[PDB]
Design a protein around this nucleic acid. Sequence first.
RNA 1: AUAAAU
Lengths: 222, 266, 70, 321, 213, 225, 236
Amino acid sequence: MSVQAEIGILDHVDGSSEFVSQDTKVICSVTGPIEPKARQELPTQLALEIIVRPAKGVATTREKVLEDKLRAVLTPLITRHCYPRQLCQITCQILESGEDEAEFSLRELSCCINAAFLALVDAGIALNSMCASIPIAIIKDTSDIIVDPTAEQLKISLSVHTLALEFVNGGKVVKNVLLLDSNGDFNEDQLFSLLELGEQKCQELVTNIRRIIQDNISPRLV
Amino acid sequence: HMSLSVAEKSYLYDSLASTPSIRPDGRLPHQFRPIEIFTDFLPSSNGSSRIIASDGSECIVSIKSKVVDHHVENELLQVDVDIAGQRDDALVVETITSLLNKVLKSGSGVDSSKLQLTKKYSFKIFVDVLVISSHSHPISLISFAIYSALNSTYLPKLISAFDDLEVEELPTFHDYDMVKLDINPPLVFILAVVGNNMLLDPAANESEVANNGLIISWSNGKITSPIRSVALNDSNVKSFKPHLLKQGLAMVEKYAPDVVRSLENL
Amino acid sequence: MERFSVLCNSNISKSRAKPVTNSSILLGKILPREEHDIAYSKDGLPNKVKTEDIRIRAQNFKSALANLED
Amino acid sequence: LETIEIHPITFPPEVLARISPELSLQRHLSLGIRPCLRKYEEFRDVAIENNTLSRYADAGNIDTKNNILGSNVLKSGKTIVITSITGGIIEETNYASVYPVVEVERGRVGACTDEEMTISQKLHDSILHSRILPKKALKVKAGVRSANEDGTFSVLYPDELEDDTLKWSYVLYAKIVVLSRTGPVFDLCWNSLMYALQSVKLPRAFIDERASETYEIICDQTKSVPLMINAKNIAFASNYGIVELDPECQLQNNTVLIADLDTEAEETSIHSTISILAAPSGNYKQLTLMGGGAKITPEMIKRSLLLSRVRADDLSTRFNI
Amino acid sequence: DRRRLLGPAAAKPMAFEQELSLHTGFIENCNGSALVEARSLGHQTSLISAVYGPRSIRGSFTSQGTISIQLKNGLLEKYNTNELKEVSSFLMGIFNSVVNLSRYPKSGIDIFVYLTYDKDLTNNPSQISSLIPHCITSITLALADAGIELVDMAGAGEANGTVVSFIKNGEEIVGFWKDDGDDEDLLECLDRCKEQYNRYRDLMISCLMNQET
Amino acid sequence: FQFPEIAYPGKLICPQYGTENKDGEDIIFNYVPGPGTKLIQYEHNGRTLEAITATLVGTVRCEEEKRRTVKNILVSVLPGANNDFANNLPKEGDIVLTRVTRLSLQRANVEILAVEDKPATFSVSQASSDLGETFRGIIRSQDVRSTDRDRVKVIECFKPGDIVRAQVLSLGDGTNYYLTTARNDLGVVFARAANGAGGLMYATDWQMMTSPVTGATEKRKCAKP
Amino acid sequence: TFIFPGDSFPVDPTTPVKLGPGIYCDPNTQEIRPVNTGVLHVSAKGKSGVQTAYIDYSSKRYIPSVNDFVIGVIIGTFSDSYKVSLQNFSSSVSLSYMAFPNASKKNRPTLQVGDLVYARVCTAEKELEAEIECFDSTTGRDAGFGILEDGMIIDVNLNFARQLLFNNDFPLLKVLAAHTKFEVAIGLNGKIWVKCEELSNTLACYRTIMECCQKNDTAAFKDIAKRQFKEILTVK
RNA sequence: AUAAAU
């Protein structure tokens, strides 16, 4: 869980970030609230334009699924009723897969969720709560639950999982499970052992995340 | 195409739907408007034509050839239709394209024997249509141009033997020398149905008030398929009595040779 | 009106009340099929519902939504 | 405080749905019912027609024109699904999947919507990850065609050679049409595709003497072999939802979950949902979870697994008979 | 292709008594729908027609309705897209006389016809012409089921590649489609298709009465 | 009895004019087209003729509506769940349920959802709200209330998402219908707190809307039950 | 004491706290919770019974609020008002013609599209188009709000602009006065207008404020102005 | 009543 992130790296965007886990590096940008196209307009809420760009080649139907899952996470996070008839552009440019993209899209999705959240924070958009996402996998022989697996670990996996939780109260209370994307097959005992150990390492991550946020931002403030 | 008020259209209908039918111009129900035709102006192509109507309607046809294996290439004559400032996809374009390809099929209204080179190879003919301007259904306009173009087309002459089954010689053509494409291009006439009257070469304003229309092909001195009823407009389309359909076929059957005669001049 | 009779009468006569035979080669049986529902008991076995009964569930809710004001 | 006597403005059932999708749902959930007149865990009946559109529909009379290898017609409730499987021959010089083209008809012309894009990829990704179609099952076992001089036509193929090898490869193209949509339709498209994949025949291929002029490589118009896929990995789709309803219920002399989401009211107002592809063996292929409207308790996940397993048993039984 | 999944582009495709069944109103996605299945000899045709409308067009100043028809390939990819547009243009030339357009000003009616299947058997030592009367039958049913006002029932028949559509009890013609075949079949085709029209008409009227009942 | 009870589209019902003999005097029955019928022209043997023809498959119902007597009969065709109801269209004087799409300073534009019938029952107009094919309407600031027509704060009257029952004064242009909530039975009917984020609110006072759940009170234009 | 979103609040539920930027009052649960990340600033007045708060956080996308000073650009003219956009890709704001000194229904203001104006936001609703007025009552008898002429405008994050307008301990205006004479308009929408007698001085001010905006350093800013005004000399 | 409805 030794992730590294930077905030406010882009000039011509309201908010931006660069999240890195292992190899997987994703840069995200957020502009909003701004004037929406007629087909995008929502009478009462904010409209989200979510774009995902791959590390190699052009955007295909694969990234269209990454956009859809990322939408399921970001939508309830943002206090959309604050911006009626308005638009918020959210663009993710995956710079480095950190995994065999021909087989997996696990780490890229989690990194996009974390980066998008950070970019929304930087942009100063109304959020109902906080959020964190981690990729999880299960081994073929050992059947161990590995949090933040490497590319080599994924090759020899039986199932791959994306978990994104909604946190409140100083990152101590799990408000809800925004997204759980499990591909593979499962046993109940392993799942809750995963959730128990997973919650611990997530809580450690938030604490680290809070440290990073304060350290960088405080010199800017008075 | 043309936009007319309700008053103008009714007056036009009265003028044309009358028992002694009168064109707004004054034409007779079988008189065509004057056209101009240019041929053999594209040296890069095997044949070419350019037709200009009286209302400024202009169409350009080009004829190119290509040696193909007639055992794998079923269609030996491909018609392609285009309009600058117009998308290719449009309903009108594809319909006319589909229609024209049927009019000039290999074994329907065209002597495809004159395209054969050897046992195994034949000449594929590409008929490219470019409609610069048009104010009505250009199907008959294009037809006249294709006719003129195909009657002034010159194809390369073969030198090598014509038996690929045995000796199998590569198709070679003698330099300079060419043979004129002897063929009988069909014509496509379009009629307008206003009440109980039938008009040859419908004008723009005439087509707007017409109840229906007919597209009748013509080849070898007789009526031939494709024959299609067509709505010239979409606001005044009505069903027609069968005798009108038989009247139209009869009308073309007697005035077509006159058109061909004025068109057959080299 | 008499003209109506000869033409109208002729037109009415023509149909002949001809018999109709019903069949579907493939699509017809499956596509026009009305909506249906099933319920899985504690046994894990599926259970069917009478068509009349299913409607009753509909008409009972409509009465419980309209009339039964609180 | 205020104590107030006032009347809530009531609307007809069909007007209440147009006015508010959430309000029309809450009034239903208060009586233990749904806008589609079903209970909390009540699903939709499923009736299918397999191999009706395929060329291998009839044993005696085989279609010479039809290029469909496998087919399936499905209708769950109001929504109708028509799946057709086509093929290709590709030279080759762990598991794979098929390439689906879903066309959801809403009565609007234009390009493919984001719905059709995601589903096509979701069907391709799930099949690829559920390990249904191995790359070895797509291997083309060719043959030879030797012709007598008008004396006879001879065709020869060898079973033994292919086993020893243990090489043209098959590619399965799919097209899924959707009529009468009423909600989340990914599950319907998956189930129809699964039934279609259960019955696929791969025609044998061979070449008449030819030289690497133009040479046409051809498949046989009659002989074919059934596609061998892992039945142990075969899964089925079902959708579930989580929501909370405020309204009070009268009495005459704590979260709730809904199974198989349908109707606009449920698709629009329920933001906590669960999607499962479950297998009869009890191995599970995939799980889709997203909570956006309410908390997702672990007790509700378990019910979904049980509900999904039950659905798999039901779907599996239908396939057998 | 970044829109759909076409798969490998380096690959190649595969290389190798009149009876009617009518059903309408089985689609809740549109305003009117129809299912037409016909089996003759070894040849059979099943197509679905979907009608959406009449729906208002913003800013439209048209004093009458606007009909749009599009044919689609449901399963078998046989008919060319160019030919589908041609029939569509032919079909619209028919129903613009059939549909009472004066009833729907500033409005438009979209008609989708899905040719899910046609089965053709040919013996070895036009084509779409035979499907045309079934498309007309389907649309006329789908329009009447939708609530669209029709001046008369539109029906047709196919005789030796010569299709001709009738209304007002065969007294007049709303469409004529002739391809190939043979000459001097004018009087014959008009009489044979008129029988097919009357047959298709009564079954169409009975269909509405049945489902409507 | 002379005319068929049920007519399919294209079936002849009755001629243009009609008459009968009773009480030693000719009574003239005047047949007029209605919903489901269309007066068209048919000619036989070179003779022109106008007759009432049904355009919808339904049972047929007649009803009288208004020396020598005088009469008027209304001929119509009624179909006979799914409801379509196209004949129904917003006309001057009708009551219409609408939903607020956007708020401006001098006016408030909405979209038409359903229309009130006549003797409650309503006619729901089915359309896509994510396209714009739905009929749009505009409520002027002067048409908000009869009380103080000049100065009216639109923010304190309506709200994005709130349901408003109004009456259409006129068609206007193709873009916006004219809507007035001047009378007592017109105004915001259904609404929620904080643009729909909070709980349901009910109408108490004509210019005040409260919520008996969170105790929230927002200023709206409320109607009377 | 940095504050993060979803952070617990010490204050008791019965006693109200006045809303501040960063602080959000949930319309559904009625709870008061922070939604922005930064430093919490709270002011208490009297022995007991009243409170106020907000969060100083780094944001750059302006959201119109009552009594906020903003610098806008009038893109276009409507029938009764100007269309002015405070910020790029941001909703338009409604400026009344009658919102000027000596206004009349007969004579419209002479402001043309492309002019800079100093304005204050009068009425700003979340679900309604915002409105600004050239003259603000609160400041004094005379607003001092008039369309700016020439000069140069500077992009700046909302925090930097708020500190420049309300904080007197901010050395930026002082260190610039130690180098040249200049007039400055400060907008809460993150816009700073600077104008000198000579372009080289205005340019020097632009470059300093930009670096100051970038640098965010008290010690650096005094030096920054030194090297900037120096560099212009040689460049001359 | 000194220039009205982009």
